[PDB]
Amino acid sequence: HHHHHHMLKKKQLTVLDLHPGAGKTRRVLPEIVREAIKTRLRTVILAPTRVVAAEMEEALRGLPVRYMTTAVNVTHSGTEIVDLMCHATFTSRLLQPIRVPNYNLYIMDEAHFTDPSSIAARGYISTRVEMGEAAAIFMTATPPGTRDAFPDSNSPIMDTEVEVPERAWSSGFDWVTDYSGKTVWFVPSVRNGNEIAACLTKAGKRVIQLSRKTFETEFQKTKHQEWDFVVTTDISEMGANFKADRVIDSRRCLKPVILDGERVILAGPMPVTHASAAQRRGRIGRNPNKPGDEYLYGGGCAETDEDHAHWLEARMLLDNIYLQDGLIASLYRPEADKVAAIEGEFKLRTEQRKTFVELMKRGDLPVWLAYQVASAGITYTDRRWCFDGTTNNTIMEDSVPAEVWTRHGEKRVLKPRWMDARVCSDHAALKSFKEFAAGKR
Ligand SMILES: Nc1ncnc2c1ncn2[C@@H]1O[C@H](COP(=O)(O)OP(=O)(O)O)[C@@H](O)[C@H]1O
Ligand code: BEF
Ligand SMILES: [Mn+2]
């Protein structure tokens, strides 16, 4: 009930870069949506995750918003001119035949998200603005290329550089376990998080683990049950709210890297960006009444992340989104220097584009891998490629060849024609890929 008037300018992109916890998501977003409604601007709100989409409903209760996500179960009047969906849904719809409205205003929250669908959505939106067809607001405390890892916070934070373990320990890290508060611990990989979580559990701690595959289900447990540690990958940088007193940050993670144009490996761990570091630290210091919060960090930051597969993968997506005849959207300008590709090199014809989309949406394949399969002319249900690669593409778990009973009634060793380490980097990813290779997804 203290609305501040925003003069929403046509043909403009604004970056709302207030510090973490300043109220972008909970205060400024509703104000903008009210102005958009008042002035009758057809508007889309882009949430990074289903978890945040649900929370945005609380902030927007009593405003006419169409929630285009099963994460919210609200009765729609059919008259709403504001739509809410996830970054990934927005990009996926753009790749499909499905008509996406030509919105007058795009509001992307947690616009730092570097998953390929988010990077692509930013390119599309910025292109629409540059063409004079729409306005946009990108909300993030950490715009592309920030070099500040220690922004302002609602309460003071105690910043300390320490040695952070990335393996189980039996001594040398008493400060981790001799602590009666609640800790969010950012780890370099799902497997390292499993090992640390087991160590913590053996030491009597209650641990919840979060990764992209599990986030949308395990995050609820952080609200609804008692815990001592959350052990999380980078997915928790995207507007994740914890009632926590301490963050432990390894400051590095495994990175997918395309090697010689022919395979994806997981390299590193390599340092995180300043943006990632500031978002990780930004999970604490958020309560103005609580002055004790600590950030313990394990090394430096770097901006040398052009080796990351996500940039090229964003181009694969954008190349397959229609704007106008002959026009391919560039990445948003601050990100466009991250990748050297020819605009349109990854454009697919209609049937192959359909396969590319289905491999990602229903197959849950990484963008790069989905592209290799689709561009080879393979149809979605034809899994022969999972078995006919070279011998060095053999997938191992527990030091033995992963084996599958195939749709054609043979026990076969998983040996994909194209190797993307993301499909076999932890037990759960591998299980899903084995199902896929069996024709049982
Ligand atoms: N359910 C809640 N009730 C009350 N305050 C909350 C709730 N969730 C978050 N907050 C607080 O609201 C403030 C603004 O949060 P938010 O808008 O999410 O920040 P930003 O998007 O700027 O990072 C912060 O102090 C945050 O901790
Ligand atoms: F910048 Be807030 F943490 F979304
Ligand atoms: Mn936010």
Residue numbers in the entry: 177 to 617
Give the published text.
A central question in discovering the molecular mechanism of a biological machine is understanding how chemical hydrolysis of the nucleotide (e.g., ATP) is coupled with conformational changes that result in mechanical work. To date, three species of metal fluoride complexes have enabled observation of molecular events that couple the catalytic steps of phosphoryl (PO3–) transfer to conformational changes by protein crystallography or cryo-electron microscopy (cryo-EM) and by 19F solution NMR. These are tetrahedral BeF3– ground state analogues (GSA), octahedral AlF4– transition state analogues (TSA) and trigonal bipyramidal (tbp), isosteric MgF3– TSA complexes. While motif V is known to be responsible for RNA binding in other NS3h,12,31 our results reveal how ATP hydrolysis can be coupled with mechanical translocation of RNA.
The tightening of the active site conformation is also seen in our 1.7 Å resolution crystal structure of the NS3h containing bound MnADP-BeF3–, which represents a GSA complex. The structure of this complex was obtained by soaking Be2+ and F– into NS3h-MnADP crystals. In this structure, the oxygen OW1 of the hydrolytic water molecule lies 3.7 Å from Be atom, donating H-bonds to F1 (3.1 Å) and to the side-chain C=O of Q455 (2.8 Å) in a prehydrolytic near attack conformation. These distances are significantly longer than those in an ssDNA-bound NS3h-MnADP-BeF3– complex for HCV,12 showing that polynucleotide binding for NS3h tightens the pre-TS complex. Conformation B adopts the “relaxed” position as in the structures of NS3h-MnADP-BeF3–, where the G415 amide is 4.0 Å from water OW1 and is H-bonded (3.4 Å) to the backbone carbonyl of E413. Second, OWat in the MgF3(Wat)− complex in the TS is liberated and moves 1.5 Å away from PG to become triply coordinated to O2A, O1G, and R459, which fix it 4.3 Å from the nucleophilic water Ow1 and thus unable to contribute to or impede catalysis of ATP hydrolysis. This additional water can also be found in the same location in both our NS3h-MnADP-BeF3– complex structure and in a high-resolution NS3h-ADP structure.
